Amino acid sequence: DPTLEWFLSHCHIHKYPSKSTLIHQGEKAETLYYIVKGSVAVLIKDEEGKEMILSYLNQGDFIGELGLFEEGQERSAWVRAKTACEVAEISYKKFRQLIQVNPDILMRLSAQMARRLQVTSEKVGNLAFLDVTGRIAQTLLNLAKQPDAMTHPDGMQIKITRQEIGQIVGCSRETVGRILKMLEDQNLISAHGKTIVVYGTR
Amino acid sequence: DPTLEWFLSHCHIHKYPSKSTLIHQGEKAETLYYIVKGSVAVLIKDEEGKEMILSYLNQGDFIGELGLFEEGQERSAWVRAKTACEVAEISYKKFRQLIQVNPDILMRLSAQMARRLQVTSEKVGNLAFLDVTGRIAQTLLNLAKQPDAMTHPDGMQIKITRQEIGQIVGCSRETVGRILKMLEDQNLISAHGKTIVVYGTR
Ligand SMILES: Nc1nc2c(ncn2[C@@H]2O[C@@H]3COP(=O)(O)O[C@H]3[C@H]2O)c(=O)[nH]1
Numbered sequence: 085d086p087t088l089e090w091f092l093s094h095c096h097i098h099k100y101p102s103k104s105t106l107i108h109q110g111e112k113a114e115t116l117y118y119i120v121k122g123s124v125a126v127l128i129k130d131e132e133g134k135e136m137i138l139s140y141l142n143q144g145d146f147i148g149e150l151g152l153f154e155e156g157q158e159r160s161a162w163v164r165a166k167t168a169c170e171v172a173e174i175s176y177k178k179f180r181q182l183i184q185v186n187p188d189i190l191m192r193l194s195a196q197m198a199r200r201l202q203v204t205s206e207k208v209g210n211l212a213f214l215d216v217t218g219r220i221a222q223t224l225l226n227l228a229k230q231p232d233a234m235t236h237p238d239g240m241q242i243k244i245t246r247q248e249i250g251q252i253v254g255c256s257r258e259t260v261g262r263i264l265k266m267l268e269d270q271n272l273i274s275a276h277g278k279t280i281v282v283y284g285t286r
Numbered sequence: 287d288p289t290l291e292w293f294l295s296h297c298h299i300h301k302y303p304s305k306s307t308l309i310h311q312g313e314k315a316e317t318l319y320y321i322v323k324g325s326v327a328v329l330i331k332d333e334e335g336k337e338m339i340l341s342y343l344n345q346g347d348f349i350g351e352l353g354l355f356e357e358g359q360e361r362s363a364w365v366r367a368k369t370a371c372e373v374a375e376i377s378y379k380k381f382r383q384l385i386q387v388n389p390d391i392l393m394r395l396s397a398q399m400a401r402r403l404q405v406t407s408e409k410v411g412n413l414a415f416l417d418v419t420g421r422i423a424q425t426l427l428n429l430a431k432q433p434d435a436m437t438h439p440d441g442m443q444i445k446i447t448r449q450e451i452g453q454i455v456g457c458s459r460e461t462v463g464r465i466l467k468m469l470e471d472q473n474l475i476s477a478h479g480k481t482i483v484v485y486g487t488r
């Protein structure tokens with residue numbers, strides 16, 4: 085992407101060793117980040133040292149967007165390297181100058197936000213929907229470890245139709261295909277016809 | 287606000303009476319709305335026909351931006367007028383033009399997408415996390431339907447702790463409490479301690 089390269093060439097590129105902390109909750113927000121490689125966890129820590137993960141962000145995602153539109157904000161949360169990371173940084177002021185010169189870089193930042201909203205809104209429904217989603221996920225992990233599963237470079241590959249999944253967990257063909265699609269979008273599987281690759285099953 | 291006025295003059299205004307329907311789930315998205323006056327309900331319907339209100343938008347809120355960034359996507363929710371509303375509208379293709387001459391109108395839209403992203407829950411979980419989420423959801427359904435549950439104006443209410451849920455599903459109280467917070471934010475339950483209200487279910 086030329087609009088991205090052109091953006092990058094105005095940024096300071098920083099390398100974060102894995103599990104180092106890029107952002108501390110409470111600090112003044114002045115920098116926009118973009119992830120060149122690697123991945124991060126957005127998280128919250130209580131006073132006892134218990135964590136909750138709010139979000140994972142990966143290559144292509146920005147971090148800090150809201151701070152671009154609301155000057156003088158504190159960091160809402162910590163951000164931690166989930167793997168070694170390369171991360172491009174630019175000040176909010178400088179990014180605001182790039183915007184005036186090239187409205188495209190803001191469309192890139194906005195699209196990236198829209199796709200994150202779309203992907204997470206595929207999971208949303210009521211408690212019966214979460215229940216059926218969980219039972220599908222659990223079926224896919226079980227199948228991944230049965231003797232008919234095949235070793236695949238990304239995980240384990242299995243063969244099963246939407247109809248059979250629906251009979252195992254009790255829902256329609258349609259509700260199954262909706263949930264496998266939410267799962268691919270979460271990058272937890274890839275699916276083509278009846279071939280499903282379940283990622284990360286060793 | 288000059289930026290909003292200059293944008294409002296490039297839009298057609300339409301008046302929408304209460305309970306009218308601005309946006310239909312699944313129809314082609316090619317238009318951006320902005321609320322000039324009034325409020326609206328963003329919603330989905332379950333497998334039978336019950337409604338789950340995702341959110342309320344009010345005057346000054348964009349609606350329907352998601353199609354702007356992506357090849358012909360379809361509306362992902364219904365949008366309905368809660369009070370009567372005056373609503374500005376403009377085609378995607380025309381709005382992208384306004385962006386090239388005036389990015390500051392994109393900044394207005396993009397700031398709202400960013401505030402929403404920052405409050406959006408349910409963003410994370412691999413298959414095993416979805417499984418334990420689904421089982422917690424099914425456990426709240428089971429409990430709320432049991433012969434000892436108490437009625438409540440918005441669903442059923444049960445007395446149960448995080449640790450007790452954990453014992454039923456096999457996981458730690460901490461993992462239960464994290465998932466209950468996500469279920470709260472989704473407006474599915476209220477779980478402010480030792481009583482959980484499971485909405486809309488008996
Ligand atoms: N608070 C919060 N921040 C998130 C979330 N997901 C991604 N982030 C990003 O993490 C950033 C942390 O610093 P900021 O508060 O500036 O901006 C936050 C966001 O851009 C989330 O679910 N909650």
Ligand SMILES: Nc1nc2c(ncn2[C@@H]2O[C@@H]3COP(=O)(O)O[C@H]3[C@H]2O)c(=O)[nH]1
Pocket residue numbers: 205309315328340341348349350351352353360361362363364365
């Ligand atoms: N799906 C969904 N849409 C929302 C939500 N909040 C606001 N919206 C708006 O509802 C609109 C539905 O049509 P779009 O998909 O075009 O864009 C969506 C958003 O602008 C929400 O929580 N979920």
